[PDB]
Amino acid sequence: EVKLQQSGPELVKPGASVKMSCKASGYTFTSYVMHWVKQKPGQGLEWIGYINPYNDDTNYNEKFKGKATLTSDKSSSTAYMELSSLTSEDSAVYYCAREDYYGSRWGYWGQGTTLTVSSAKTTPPSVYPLAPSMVTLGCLVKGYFPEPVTVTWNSGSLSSGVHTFPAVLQSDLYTLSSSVTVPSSTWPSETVTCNVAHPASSTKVDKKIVPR
Amino acid sequence: DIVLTQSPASLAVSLGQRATISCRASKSVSTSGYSYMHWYQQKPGQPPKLLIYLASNLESGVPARFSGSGSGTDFTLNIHPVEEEDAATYYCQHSRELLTFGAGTKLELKRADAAPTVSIFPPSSEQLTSGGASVVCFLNNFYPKDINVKWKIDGSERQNGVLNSWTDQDSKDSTYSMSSTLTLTKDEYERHNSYTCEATHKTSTSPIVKSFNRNEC
Ligand SMILES: [Mg+2]
Ligand SMILES: [Mg+2]
Ligand SMILES: [Mg+2]
Numbered sequence: 001e002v003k004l005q006q007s008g009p010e011l012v013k014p015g016a017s018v019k020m021s022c023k024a025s026g027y028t029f030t031s032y033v034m035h036w037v038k039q040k041p042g043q044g045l046e047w048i049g050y051i052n053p054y055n056d057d058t059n060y061n062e063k064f065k066g067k068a069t070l071t072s073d074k075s076s077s078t079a080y081m082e083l084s085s086l087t088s089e090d091s092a093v094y095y096c097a098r099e100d101y102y103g104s105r106w107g108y109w110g111q112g113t114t115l116t117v118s119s120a121k122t123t124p125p126s127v128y129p130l131a132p133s134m135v136t137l138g139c140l141v142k143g144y145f146p147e148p149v150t151v152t153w154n155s156g157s158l159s160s161g162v163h164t165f166p167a168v169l170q171s172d173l174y175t176l177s178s179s180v181t182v183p184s185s186t187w188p189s190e191t192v193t194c195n196v197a198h199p200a201s202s203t204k205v206d207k208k209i210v211p212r
Numbered sequence: 213d214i215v216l217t218q219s220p221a222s223l224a225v226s227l228g229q230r231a232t233i234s235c236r237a238s239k240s241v242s243t244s245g246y247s248y249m250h251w252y253q254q255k256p257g258q259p260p261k262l263l264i265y266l267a268s269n270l271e272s273g274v275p276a277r278f279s280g281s282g283s284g285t286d287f288t289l290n291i292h293p294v295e296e297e298d299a300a301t302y303y304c305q306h307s308r309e310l311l312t313f314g315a316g317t318k319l320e321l322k323r324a325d326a327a328p329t330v331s332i333f334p335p336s337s338e339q340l341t342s343g344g345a346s347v348v349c350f351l352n353n354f355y356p357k358d359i360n361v362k363w364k365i366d367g368s369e370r371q372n373g374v375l376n377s378w379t380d381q382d383s384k385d386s387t388y389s390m391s392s393t394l395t396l397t398k399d400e401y402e403r404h405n406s407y408t409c410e411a412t413h414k415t416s417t418s419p420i421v422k423s424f425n426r427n428e429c
Contacts, residue, residue, distance in 0.1 A: 035311070045260065045303060045313045061310075095259055103266040104307045105250050109259035130333040130348055138333050138348055140393075163352060165377040165391045175375065177391045179331070179350045212337075212429050 002026040004096055006110035011146040011200065012117055016086050020113045022079040022096030029077040030054040035106065036070065036081050037095040050099070051079055086117045116146045120172035124201035125149060127194070129209045130177075133184040134161075137209045139194035143173045150197040151178045158182065158192065214239050218304050218314030226322045227386075230292040233317045235304030240284040242267075250305045251280055251289045253298075254316075256380045260303060264289065296321060299381045321386040327415040328354035328390070332408075332422040335401060345401035347394045349409035349422065353387040360412035361392040362419070365404045370394065402426070 005023040012018050022034065036048040049060035053072035060068060067090070069082040079096055096110040123145045130138025141149055151164050161181035167174040178194060186192075193208045218235045225231045241248045247267035252260040262271045264280035267287060277298075279290050291298055299321050304314035328351040335345040351361060357378075363370045373395040381388060392409055410421035 044316050047311045047313065050311075097259075099307075103246060103250070103269070104248060105262055105265035105271070106252075106260075106305075107262050107265075107271065109261075112259055126339075126342065128336040128339045128346070130336060132331075132333070136329070136331040136350060136352070138331075138350065140336070140339075140346055140348060142339075142344075142346065163350070163379055163389045163391075165379060165389070168375045168377050170375060175393070176377065177348055177350075177393065179352060179389075179391070181352075 002098065002108045004098060004108055004110035006094075006096060006113045008199070009114045009146070009148060010116070011122065012086055012115070013119055014087050014117055016117070017082060017084045018086065018115065019080055019082045020094055020115075022081075022110050024077045024079070024098070027098075029072075030074055032101075033099040034070075034072070034079040035097045035099055036068070036079075037097065038064075038092050039095065039112075040092045045095075048081070048094075053079065083115070086115075088117050091115055091117050114147065118146065118172075120145050122146065122200050123173060124203045125196060125198050125205075127196045127205045127207050129194070129207045131209050131211050134181050135184045135187050136179055136181045137187065137192055138180075139178045139196070139207065139209075140175070141177070141196050142175045144175075144198055144201070145173050146200055147174060148199075149174075149176065150199075151176075152195045153178075153180045154193060155195055214241065214306060214309060214312065216304055216306055216312050216314045218317060220317060221315065222318050222320065224320040224322055225294050227296065228293045230290060231294050231298070231319060233289040233291075233302050233304075233319075235282075235287045235289075235314050237285055237287075237306065241306050241308065242284045247283055247287070248306055248308055249280075249282070249287045251278075252303045252305060253300050254303065255300045255383075263302075291319075294319075294321070296386050297383050299383060299386065320381060323355055323386040325415045326353060326355045326387055327413060327420060328352060328359065328411050330409065330411055330420050330422045332424055334407070334424055334426065335398075340398045340401070343398050345396050345398050347396075347401075347407050347409075349392045349394075351390040351392065351409075351411050353382070353385070353389060354411075354413060354415075355387050356414055357381075357388045358414065359388075359390060361390065362410045362412070363392070363394050364406075364408040364410065364423075366406050367408075 125144035
């Protein structure tokens with residue numbers, strides 16, 4: 001099938017330039033125009049511009065004329081976006097999308113690349129188990145930078161009763177928590193464990209929830 | 213120069229009701245033949261998804277509960293019957309000249325009022341021995357979204373070092389959840405005996421409170 005694979009999250013310092021990629025597969029690359037969109041947390045979709053990979057023609061929303069440069073490489077079936085003169089206002093999720101011949105509809109989208117433009121240093125999380133009919137257990141992931149972290153329980157086995165809350169930034173560090181609810185018969189008779197990944201610091205930590 | 217005005221910005225509907233979302237344009241988007249209006253659905257942490265193309269064509273793989281209509285200057289997206297999974301933001305879109313997205317409509321589900329299930333956690337031993345102390349309070353699966361959390365130590369309100377975080381509306385049951393964390397130093401924590409988080413919510417007249425005594429274990 002058609003697929004659009006965007007590059008992973010990026011943290012850059014202010015003033016820098018960054019180049020995101022959008023790797024297409026499952027179709028003839030040069031036949032379709034590719035668009036880019038900006039979306040800031042909890043806000044609408046802002047069109048950036050497009051690249052026609054067949055002739056490398058481009059057009060931009062005025063807002064990004066100075067800011068964004070779109071390119072494509074026919075060999076690698078990859079569209080690129082270069083953002084320049086970065087500031088914190090450019091921190092956002094960036095999406096690529098393919099425009100279809102069928103009514104100019106955008107039927108296929110990349111998963112999104114999250115950009116953080118920050119001066120703060122990369123820092124791994126400290127993971128703390130929260131131990132105390134159903135039982136709710138917890139996992140505190142404190143003092144990391146940048147986003148994202150990935151939390152799971154029993155490697156996804158307990159996905160059902162889980163709430164992983166959005167990270168909150170304080171003093172240039174993020175903190176979040178995750179709750180899991182299970183039957184009081186299952187715990188502590190069987191082991192529950194939160195798994196936390198912080199790719200930016202190459203961190204994979206497991207903490208078993210043990211009664212006090 | 214075609215301006216898209218989408219309305220309403222917010223819509224709350226009961227399970228089974230009809231939702232209707234409108235998008236109008238300053239000029240006709242249908243003068244050359246087909247109507248260049250598309251509709252998208254976006255859920256938190258996901259890219260937008262195409263629902264309807266060219267005003268009224270249902271995209272492959274999307275359910276018949278969704279339908280589009282209109283022509284020229286006025287367009288609607290109808291969802292009927294509305295399901296719990298439809299909690300999302302919906303966008304209209306036009307290209308032709310300057311590609312433009314509507315401002316979006318956030319669809320929220322209505323449901324029965326529900327008190328939070330409140331659970332409170334003392335700092336883990338691992339944290340205390342690194343010199344810190346976070347007291348965590350979960351307030352889970354409640355409705356409606358508005359809720360007040362208060363922290364008390366030895367029977368009196370504290371406000372410093374409190375961080376709150378809220379989830380989006382649940383896909384399955386349409387409830388909301390919240391965490392509140394009170395952070396102090398290890399030394400500060402060990403100077404007090406009683407810790408309390410209390411929720412003021414629309415369901416009860418009295419607040420829901422959970423507490424613990426540091427010196428239990
Ligand atoms: Mg979906
Ligand atoms: Mg219920
Ligand atoms: Mg002190």
